[model samples]
Structures are given as structure tokens and as C-alpha cells.
Target chain A: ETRPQALLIKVPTEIVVKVVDDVDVAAPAVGQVGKFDDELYDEAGAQIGTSSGNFRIEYVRPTDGGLLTYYQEDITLSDGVIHAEGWADFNDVRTSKWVFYPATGVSGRYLGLTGFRQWRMTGVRKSAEARILLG
Target chain B: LLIKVPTEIVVKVVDDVDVAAPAVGQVGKFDDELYDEAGAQIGTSSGNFRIEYVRPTDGGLLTYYQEDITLSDGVIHAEGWADFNDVRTSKWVFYPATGVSGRYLGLTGFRQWRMTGVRKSAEARILLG
Candidate 1:
């Protein structure tokens, strides 16, 4: 049998959560709320399933100057966190993620994962939400 | 920068099971709180909207399909889902009931309507309304 090593490196710094629908997420302290900003967006989103309040969020960004378009996105939420993971294509580039946040106080680091996209979406939004501060 | 939604967007459906529940009118009781989104407020399912099981028919294979339904005290498309009840079996089932407004991830729709019949297998195609 082997003994355990350092626990400091193994534990999360800010209560790390995988941000799924809270189904696959277990074994730690769980609550109905999380941390984030733009309180008006997701009012206590949800913990296990999709939130109707979440549908209002638009993830797509348009580009190409009205000629050839690029970057269309669809988002879904589980337990209040917005999850935009599946597949995206642009010259063999794909973007996807499953995020988590508190239903209210929804403001935090969005690009917190190890894998992120190189190309960014640019366009005038059909609708805009309050400026979210990444804590 | 992270994206957010606008207030102009109406909340058609939230608590899938909460809002989808039969109203006090049909359930033979004045229990409006049981089915209303505000039910959770009076020690009920407040902010407790329940989401109905949303699936698709032909498993998004056909790219288009169709169905008919009805609604009460609101628009037929109020919550982006179609409500159904199987009287013969006394059971209820929801399908591709809700959907977004535009095309997505190689998927497109012409109708503002939505359904819940998800493609169960690779041979199915979701019919566009």
C-alpha cells in the first residue's frame, strides 16, 4: 500500500467546481448558489437542470463584415452555470466548455479551463448583458 | 468579456416541471401555487420551475418533423414547449417542446415553434418546423 502525499496541491484554491448540472459533481460541499457577477442575468440559475432564465443568454458572435460569417454559438445551463460544449468548426477549430456560477452574483473567471480557443468571436451583439467582472 | 442576456427576452418557460404542471383549473383544485412559478414563494416551488424532459423525434436525423398541440391562459408558444396528455393511457409526454430562435451547430429552423422529440438513434433526423 502507498501513503498519501501533499494535500495542499490536491485541494482547490477557490472551491473548484466542474460546473456541470450538479449530477456528475459530488463528494464536496454543494449549495443552491455560487459566485459570479451580473446578478440580473441568472437569478439563482439552477443546480441540476436547465434554467429558463438561462435561455436569454446568447453566446454567438458575428464577424466577416456582412460578407462571409463566422462563429455561431448555442448555450445551455445546468444548475445555474452556462455550458457551451459540443463542437465548433472554422478551418478545423472547435470551441466548447461547461461553466458554473452562482444563480445570482454571477461574475467570475470564464476561461478557467486548461483548453481554450485561439480564435475569438467578434460582432455587435443582438442583445447585451451587464459587464461581468472576472474575479 | 463574458456575454449576458437582455431583459427584452420574455421568460416563456423556466421551471419545466413547475410551469408545465397542470394549472389549478384543470387539476380540480384552486392550487394556483402548485403550478405557478410563484408557488415556491408560499412555501411552494418558488423560483422552482421544473423542466419537462425535452427530447426529439427521429433523433435530429430527418432535420424536420411536425406535431399539433394546445395551450391555456397564455400563448401557444409561451414557454417554447408543446404540452401533451395521453388520455388513453392517462399519461403525459413532452417533446422537442422548446427551441432557440436561430440556426445552431449545423442546425437550422424556420418556425418559431419548438418540440421535444430528441433523436434516439443515428438514423433519425429532426424535422424542421
Candidate 2:
């Protein structure tokens, strides 16, 4: 079957708070990075997906760790944009939890983009693997 | 079969820049409103979003958290969300919430934040055309 028009891009994982512990964040190995795109300019670039400034991080807690049968961790997140630290959103983990912030920041002026400008990851055909697709 | 020739149409590209329109889903009359969490009712902020605890067993592929489905007003609240790659695949995994209790039985992981304060480590915003 052909790949879907929309694609997923795994994002680079940023350690939440190294002061908290980097090894903890890296232990499970990786928190997936996500990107998305609709443009298929590069046919060979089909492997590339894209990411919005939007993203989320979620993982299931292993049974041994939590006293309960199982547990999960869904972090509120933000897309990395302005500064080295700027990112997407909150850890909306509860079965039902939602929060919204006002969108007042400037549109496309990225502090991360001085020598470059990008807002995506790459296109995808599979469900897990991803690649860098934007500058 | 008949072949017809039509005149070409001129498509002019307007080379220009534009500022984004205003935000969406804002609850007008802010200070007049309020919210409650943990049995505590607090006054409203600039804006707010609603969360509801759903039966984990109830949702299906047609209604996953990361898939982009149109809300009643025709705007979309996306579910089926994934990072880089999608490992969750329309799964409604229960993610337990947490806050540092100072004393804990077991801890999942520890980490540092790029931003710290009463300010946000992150936030969600609504965009409307």
C-alpha cells in the first residue's frame, strides 16, 4: 500500500531537567521525537517526515515500578521554537485533563533559526522509524 | 467525443507577508469566571481548557487521542498524536498524573527542565482562522 499523505517525524529528545537526572530520561533509551509534513517535494525524501512546533511525550509505567497493575505518563508538551529552551505544551496526563494558552508569540521568527529556518521533521511510511526532513 | 479549447486564465501571485489571525476557544469575560481542581475552586486566568476523565475501555480507533477529529464548531482537536514516529497507534493508555510529594515509594524517572518557574514549561494554544 502507498504511504499516507501526512507523515510522522520523531523528535530529538531533550532531557527534561538534567538536574533531575539525565540517565532517567535516557534509560528507556528514547522518548520518540515527532514531526509531520504534507509536501513531498523530494521523492527520495519520502522517508522524511515533519514536526509541527506541536509535540507530546507519553510512556507507560512498567508494572514492577508502580504498585498498581500498570501506570502511564503523558507529559504536556510544547514545540521547540524561540529560545534554546522554548517548547510546546503541558503534561496533560490525567484521563481527562486539558489546558489552553493564548497564542501571542510572533509567527515565524525563530531564535533557533539564525542561520537556518525550519518547522518540520520528515515524511514516513512506517510507524516507528523517522528522519530529519527540514532545516 | 469532442475536444474543446478554452482560453487560459491568468493567475497572479500576490507576493506578500501576513500576520496570523486571533486565537480561538477563548472564554470571554475572564475575571468573572472560575475553575476547580482537587476540590479547590480558583478564579479564572486569561484562558482555560476543559478536561474530562473518560472510560479507558470506551474509546476506539474512530476516537483516539492523537487523531485529528473536528470538534462541534468544525475546528479540530487532534487525537492519534505521535512524536517522530507513532508507537501509541490509537491506544488509550492510562497515563497517571504526578507531582513531587517530597517522599515517595517508587519513582519512575528524574530529569531537568529547560524552563523553570510559576511560568510554563509548556502550554497549548488554539488557532482560529
Candidate 3:
């Protein structure tokens, strides 16, 4: 069997962040460094894999006085047998949370793939649900 | 269809600091000033990164990084992991803020950036669409 020229793979992921350091800044000027604990699940809610990464929040949007923050994450996803590394940029605007995954930085099985990820932050805890779409 | 636009974005590393002890979860945080081809100061770029050394078949080593750049008009955010060569090049996707109305307006696209000098300077070309 052969694979198609362009393929779309959607992975549902749950993420919990453990902040290691806060830059001692006030609101709207957030600066923090953290680690990610991510779990991937199939459509049937079956555990598929896990991911680990690091994240940093640069700042919040000062133009509109919104909580829209600029951040980035670099992660490695593993499904027991295979693993892939990816980096993503996030503009965590409350209304729309979308991140771009560039193909050039993807490695291992998912190398040469570009896509996007949508996130829904729980707002209560340092947890969020996301869907990663790759083509 | 994707429209490719060639742009020159230069950066000079201003500071780099280690956030933690050398380990699996260590992060190297950095900040750089952004410039254009004409050497005009535009904005700033800041981020955190980690490097991993793997076995030969696994590509030897990888640098995982995520950066957020602030421009006069808007912002460009990027993240990726790569086994950068001597040039220290990497690929990224640029996301232009909707509020952008100046030079970078509607310039959400793929970008390729590389370290250009020994002084920790870098340059990038974007394929804007």
C-alpha cells in the first residue's frame, strides 16, 4: 500500500502545564516558562500517545487591552513506537485560539507536514483541549 | 494557491539567559532586535528553546524553539524543532495579526530563517500569501 501525496491527520490532545518560573511581571505583561504534559486520544477516547514540551509566554496584547497573549511551544509526540517533534506559535486570544505548525521543523514520521491546531483553554485550571490538524 | 513573497528580516541577539540547570527540561531564553534589509529597527523577538542530542539515525541532535516577534504593525509567531546545520537554519509559519495594516498585513505564510553571522545575528525570508 502507498500513501497519498497529501494526508490529513487529526489528533486530539489534552494538555496540562506546570509552570516552573514566572518572570515576576504584572498582568498584561506576563512572562513565564513552563513544561507541558500532553495526552493524545483517539476518537473513541482511547489513549493513543503522549507528548512533552516546553512553553514560554512573551507578552499580552497591549494594543487592545485584551488577554491575548503571544506564546510558543516545542514538543515531541510519541505513540510508543514512533515519535515526532513539532513547534507551534500561539496567539491566545480568548475568542479564537489557533496555532500554526510549520512543515520545515517537523521531524520523524510527520516530517514535511504543515498544519494548524485549535485550542480550548479550560480557564479553571492550567489545562486545555486541542485538536492538531496536519496535512 | 500560496503566494511566495521574499522578505529580509534580520535579527541581532541582544541577550540569552539560561532558565534552569542543564537537564532534560532546561530552557535557554533569548531576545533579539528585529530589522529590515535597510537595517531599520522594526521590533523585537523573544522566546525559549531546548536542545536534545539524539542517536545518529535519529538525526543526531535537535533544537526545539518557539518565538514571538513584535513588529511595528503586528506580530509574527513561530515554533519548530530542527537539526540545524552550520548555517543554523529552520522553518516556520508566520501568523500576521488581524490588526496588522502596515507592511506585514496579510502576510501569513511559510518562513525560512538562518543564523547569518558569528555575532548571533540571523536573517529570514518569508513566503507570504
Candidate 4:
């Protein structure tokens, strides 16, 4: 009898990244730029208010001859009183990986926001894909 | 009566960004503002985030390097963190801990990047009240 082949096992943890907002991002083609004008919602389904931002999907190829699609998103409200900027690289239209930055990661008055802000590609919807939800 | 621990209300946010034209000699810089579920200010974080070039992986997601952070003002009092790896990935996390990591806040990520000059950024936010 032949010995069993070694199994490559990758275990996932119980970590669940909570979404802070509920706004749909419209799908766009590469090199296409657009603005995000939608009301944001908190995790508890509470209406926060409206927001405005810019976004673009880019196509890139660094090492390999293959191409990759990446998205950049920026939002602002109250004239810098509330602001957020982030990006995401797609595995496919249905799945993505994203991150939020200092514009939305920092909470107080300081030269630098000394911490990390990141998010998970929760789900894909008709108009906008689920993202960080909060700053 | 169901007991509600502070841990239950806590939340974390992770972001992986692209560093455009990073200078090697000078400080790269990192800053972020935190918001509640309803898009309200809750906390803030500051730190350094950058990356370098490496062999391309079969994966399509952007890869990143190390992150050193500090939560200056917030209900979740994390004074700072020394050095945390894998700033951008599904496995990255920030929480309370002890030991060489310190008491401010402990950050963890999947250290899976080689020595490369690709620029990238990541963050982990913990909201406690």
C-alpha cells in the first residue's frame, strides 16, 4: 500500500472584522474615475449622514506580464472634520482585500496617527461592495 | 442578567495602502483617524508604514512590511507598540496583551513578505468603550 500524501492544511481563526458603515461602491472599469455620494450607516443600521469622495480603478503589471486591478477610494465630510481614504486589490469581482489609512485611522490631534487601520472583503453586492464600514 | 464585558463592544480595523514614491533616508510617516459605526470620531492612531520589492506571489492582493504604532488619545488607551510585522493581510490583528510586546496594545500579522522594495501600508484599529 502506498503511504498517504502529506496534507497542506491552512487553518483560519475565529476573527470577524466588524463593518462600521453601509455604503455601496459602484463597479467601474479600469482607468475610470468617479465620485462617491452616498449616505453612510453605522453597524447598528443607524443613518449617519451623507458623504462625498473620489475613486478610481487602476490596471497594473510590475514583475510578471500579467495584469492586476486595484481600487482607490477617498471620502470627506465637515471640511476635514470627517475624512477617510483607502484602497483595495481585487481577487475577483466577487472578492477583494482592502485597507483604511491615517485620514480615517487617526482619532485625535497629533502629527502622526500611531496605529494600524485595516479591513476585510466581507461581501459583494449589486452597487457597492462591503468594506471597512468605519474609519 | 447577562454580563456585558468591555471586550464585547470592541472593534478592529485593518487597512493595506500603497506607498507612492517612498524615500529611504527620511521618515515615511503614518497617520489615521478612527470613526464609530455611524461615522463619528472615536479614536486615532499614528505610526510608520512602508515596504520594498520582492518576488511576486501567485496571489493578487497587495503585500506589505512592518508597522510601529501608538494610540495617543481614545477610550482604548494603547500608548504605543514597538514593531509589528505583516501590517497588511487577513491574519493581522490588534488587542491587549503582555510581555515584550508591552501593555499599550499588541499587534500581530502574518509575516510573509521577503526583502523587496514595494511600497505598501497597513493599520489595525481597536475601539473599546
Candidate 5:
């Protein structure tokens, strides 16, 4: 019997994160904050789940005479074993970005991807952020 | 040859000027720096007035919009706007160049208060007890 020429191994996996928040933005007001939570998932659309944490909106800048507004967000997640956090900046004009903690200057550990993740938010007045990431 | 009319006759000529910002204050002596009919920096106004309301009649590339300002003394309404360039926009938005007074006779290219009506400044000298 010939010995097995070689061995092949493959770990097919994909990480998908789904964020949903009930942030009711009222008539544009400066310094307003919103809160929300996220659900982590896998390629199968199943909850791979974070050990702990959530994401939320921190503050808003109402500028441009009701034309364009900017919002800052906080991101948090965990693997039940490791804790992770992130931040994001969004505006009314379909432009947004976020990044996990340990973002350059942040101390502790560098977990998620480095730099800010790009996303888009479509609404202005009553707006919400729904984005997808594939890695 | 110049022909003079017997009655009080009026002559109209097309004139325009550029304006600098106004002085800082809550009351009189609050006026904007202006240029002369020949585009020279004229000076500031000597008094205060009110601008209750203003609306843009025409909207296009040349005309723009910015935050509206009113006098703390309940007088002088001024419209704000800027151009397309970032720097020009900031300067126009931050400065007080668009306005008119009760005694002023000319209209700047920018928005101005309607002086034809009795939309006087709300504040008047009172008999203090």
C-alpha cells in the first residue's frame, strides 16, 4: 500500500456582523446621542455571537441648515472570552466609517481590523445605519 | 447741455459697492463697513434698525443661503450666504456684509431689510421711573 502522498486541510469560514439599533433621531438637534446593539453572525446567517457588548451613537453635529448632519458612534463586541470595542463617524450624505478599539493610539490589544471600516448611512432626519461587512 | 426741471426732479444712476463687517455692540453705532460707489472702503453706519423677515425671491448659482442674524436690540435683520469655494464660503458666512438700514439710500447686491415700511426697531427710548 502506497503511503498517502500528502494531506490537505481546509477550514471554510466567514465572519459576518449584523448591527441593528433603534435610534430615533428627532428634529435635528446638536449634541444629541443615540444607543443601539449589534448581532454577530456567520456565513449561514446564524449568530456566531460575541462574548459580550454592543454599539451606540455618541453625539451628533447638526450643520448645513438642515442639509447635512454628522454622527459619532461607539462599537463594542466580545467573544465570551475576549472583549472588543470600536467607534464610527457617520453623516447624512451616505458616508460613514468605524473602527474597533486599539485603534492606533488606543492601548490594550489590537483585535479587529486596523483602521476604520467604511460604511454608509442613507437617512438624514430619521436615520439609521445598516451596513454589511464580509471578511 | 443740462436741462433743469422746475419741480423737484430725480436722477437715477446704476451704482454698487462692497461692504466690510459691522462693529460689535448691542445698540447704536452698530453699522457695517462699506465701500463707495467707486468700490472704495467707505466706512460704517452710525445707527441701528430692524429686519423682521427676509426670503429669497430667486434661487440659483449666484444666490446662496446662510444663517440669519438679528440685532439683540430687536433691530437689524441680516441675511447670510457664501460662494462655492470653501474659503469664500466661510468668509461670507462668518462676516456681516449683507444688510440695510432705515436711513440708507442704496441697496447692496446682497440681501437687505425692507426700509420702505414702518418695520422699526422694537426698542424705543422709554421714561424710566
Candidate 6:
């Protein structure tokens, strides 16, 4: 039997997103769909890339008088060097943590790499801290 | 402005039972048992799928297919595009759902990948909302 070798790379990163457009879907299911733009930066505080994506959020049920929400995102990242497509999941948008998985690395340094990015709110500002791991 | 955060979950595949025989262009079905990162039983997934094409890849054999899986939390009503590679790895993506109940009612997006072996237990990484 043969086994594949495992390799890992970690990068500290940051991101800030702005919702450009949003639409609330009221019938059938209570949800909202929106488009967003974001900026990505390296640990050294230098701008590296940008992302554009669409998101969908749905109201699951009420938790402690607030709505429990679930959200999904489809995004593309570009830096004039590497381009990749990723999908994200938010178990509760009001919470402080979420996950992103890069599905395809079309070109450059990200090509053929697979792993995930974990993000957490920094609490200092609107930006969030991201730990990116790829193998 | 918004900041998106990330989390992780582990999945283990316990059983893959075939409900139908496999044939090119014919529909096949399966029921799978799933477990969580803590080795606790979580849920079950039943799928109706069709093999659209088959090809050879460096890893081994690859089959392209589409599927609809019914989970305990809800129904993945949307047709999911999937790839079974090397007879051991499977990956897929699907969007939007309806009649979602319980804690996952608002789940609108899903993506997952699993790895299996002949003698060893299977494992997976699932990302969904």
C-alpha cells in the first residue's frame, strides 16, 4: 500500500469585508443574500490581495431570545499572482468564529495546495485575524 | 465592515451500505453512518446518485457524479456535484436548502470531502452553513 506525504504551511493573515449589496428573502424561508468585497493583508501589515464574494444567511431558530443563524459564502481571492476559490461557513453570524476552505488553487503559489483558514475577531478593530494552513 | 471567522470539525465515516448496484449512467444509492471529532455518533446520510462519467487519474480512478443527500438535520435538496477519486476520496459542493429543522434549519451552503480505505475507518472534513 502507498500513502501520500503530508506537508503543511501556516501564514498569519488579516481580512476586512464590506457588504456591498444585500437582499432579504421573506417567503418560504427567512433569509438574506448579499454581495461583499474584502481586503487581505499579511502579518507584516502589508496589503496582499482582495476578495469578492456572495453570501447567504438563514434564520434557524430563536436562541436565548436571539435568532440562531447559519451562513454560507462563495469567494474568489486574487493578488495578481495566485488566484483561488474558496467556500466559507458561519454556524452563527453573531458569533466570533468561522471557517474557510480553499477548494481550488488556479495558479501560482497556492496551486495544488489543500487545507483551511481559521478566522477570529481581533476585537481591536473591524478586521479579523486569520490563520491560514495549506498542504 | 465585517470580519469572517473560522472553526473546525472532524467527521468519521462508519458505514457505507449500497442500496443499488453500480452501473454507468444508472442511478445508485447508499446509506452512510457518520461520527464527530470526539468519536461520538452524530448522524446519517442517505444519498441518491448517478455516475455521469469515469476516467483514469494519477491517483487511481475517478468518477464524476451528482447526488442529493438527506441528512438528519435537513435535506440537501440541491443537486450536489461530486467527484470520487482513487476509489478512496470523495469531494462535493451544494447550495441552498428547504424545510430545514432543528439546529440546522438555515443551512444554505455545504461542502465536504471524505477519505476512505479498504481496511481502515474513513474520515472527513465538512464545511457548511
Best by lDDT: 3
A1-135, model 6: which lDDT tens digit per residue? 122222222234555567653443222233556565657776676766665555554333221222322333333344222333333323323356544444444455556654444456543224565544333
Which 10 consecutive residues of model 2 chain B have the lowest summed lDDT?
B1-10
Candidate DockQ scores, in order: 0.01, 0.03, 0.03, 0.03, 0.01, 0.04
Model 3, position A98, has a per-residue lDDT of: 49
Model 2 residue A53 lDDT? 33
Error of 6 at A49 (Å): 1.4
TM-score of each: 0.17, 0.17, 0.40, 0.33, 0.25, 0.41
DockQ agreement of candidate 6 with the native complex:
0.04
For A1-135, candidate 4 gives per-residue lDDT tens digits of: 132111111111112222232222454345645443544444555443344555454554353322233333333222222355434333343345433332332322211322222344344431332222221
Could you tell me the lDDT of residue A6 within candidate 1?
Answer: 10
Regions of model 3 farther than 4 Å from truth: A17-28, A60-62, A65-74, A79-96, A99-106, A123-126, B1-129
Write down the TM-score for model 6. 0.41
Stretch of 10 with least lDDT, candidate 2 chain A? A66-75
lDDT of 5 by residue, A1-135 (tens): 232221111111212233344544444343444433334434455554322234444433122243222233333323222233333333333242221121111222223322222233333323233322111
Better of 1 and 5 by lDDT: 5
Please identify which of the two predictions, 3 or 5, would achieve the higher DockQ against the true structure.
3
lDDT of each: 0.20, 0.20, 0.46, 0.32, 0.26, 0.41
- Ranking according to TM-score, highest score first: 6, 3, 4, 5, 2, 1
Docking level of model 1: incorrect
Report the Cα interface RMSD of each model, rounded to 1 decimal.
20.0, 16.9, 12.8, 17.3, 37.1, 17.6
- List model 2 lDDT by residue over A33-86, tens digit each: 332222212233332222233233333223122111111122222332221111
Local error of candidate 2 at residue B46 (angstroms): 18
Over all chains combined, what TM-score does candidate 5 have? 0.25
**Residue A135, candidate 3: alpha-carbon lDDT:** 39
DockQ category of candidate 3:
incorrect
Positional deviation of A18 in candidate 6, in angstroms?
A: 3.2
Candidate 3 clash pair list: none
Among all candidates shown, the one with the greatest DockQ: 6
Candidates in order: C-alpha RMSD to true structure: 20.2, 21.8, 12.6, 17.6, 23.9, 13.7
The lDDT ranking, best first, is: 3, 6, 4, 5, 2, 1
Q: Taking the tens digit of each residue's C-alpha lDDT, what string does model 1 give over A1-135?
A: 132111000001111122222211122111222222111223343222221221111122122111111221222223223322222222111111212121111212233321111122121111122211121
